[PDB]
Amino acid sequence: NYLYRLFRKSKLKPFERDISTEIYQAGNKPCNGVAGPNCYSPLQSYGFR
Amino acid sequence: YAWNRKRISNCVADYSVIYNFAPFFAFKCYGVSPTKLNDLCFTNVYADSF
């Protein structure tokens, strides 16, 4: 249930919340909004056990 | 069982060639983000192939 933002273009400001579930471009190739190698979802869940 | 290990030292790490080599079923990175790798400098890189 608990997720963290692995990827963002820039660092956040103090006391700012980012909830945008947009894809991030991690590679030179444009993702165009579809998951692909060099393209990753920013939000990943913690494996709490 | 006899997995190959190559030590990597004293060279520039161009990860972009790794990125574009093939379509990858998994590119999971544990403990480091994939984007920061180019801007990070490490003492040793071990490549294990199997």
UniProtKB/Swiss-Prot annotation, chain A:
The impact of changing residue 34 to A is: Increased resistance to neutralizing antibodies
Question: What top-level branch of life does the organism fall under?
Answer: Viruses
What happens after mutating residue 44 to R? In strain: Omicron/BA.1, Omicron/BA.2, Omicron/BA.2.12.1
Of the intact sequence, the residues represented are 450 to 498 of 1273
Residue pairs linked by disulfide bridges in the UniProt entry: 31-39
- According to the UniProt record, what happens if one changes residue 44 to Y? Reduced host ACE2-binding affinity in vitro
Q: Could you describe the subunit structure of this protein?
A: Binds to host ACE2. RBD also interacts with the N-linked glycan on 'Asn-90' of ACE2. Cleavage of S generates a polybasic C-terminal sequence on S1 that binds to host Neuropilin-1 (NRP1) and Neuropilin-2 (NRP2) receptors. Interacts with host integrin alpha-5/beta-1 (ITGA5:ITGB1) and with ACE2 in complex with integrin alpha-5/beta-1 (ITGA5:ITGB1). May interact via cytoplasmic c-terminus with M protein. May interact (via N-terminus) with host bilirubin and biliverdin, thereby preventing antibody binding to the SARS-CoV-2 spike NTD via an allosteric mechanism.
In this chain, the stretch annotated as Disordered covers: 6-41
Query: What is the species listed in this Swiss-Prot or TrEMBL entry?
Result: Severe acute respiratory syndrome coronavirus 2 (2019-nCoV)
Q: What name has this protein been given in UniProt?
A: Spike protein S1
Q: Where is this region: Immunodominant HLA epitope recognized by the CD8+?
A: 1-7
State how changing residue 3 to R affects the protein, per the record.
Increased resistance to neutralizing antibodies. Decreases HLA binding to NF9 epitope. Increased binding affinity to human ACE2
Q: Main role?
A: Attaches the virion to the cell membrane by interacting with host receptor, initiating the infection. The major receptor is host ACE2. When S2/S2' has been cleaved, binding to the receptor triggers direct fusion at the cell membrane. When S2/S2' has not been cleaved, binding to the receptor results in internalization of the virus by endocytosis using host TFRC and GRM2 and leading to fusion of the virion membrane with the host endosomal membrane. Alternatively, may use NRP1/NRP2 and integrin as entry receptors.
Q: Where is this region: Receptor-binding motif?
A: 1-49
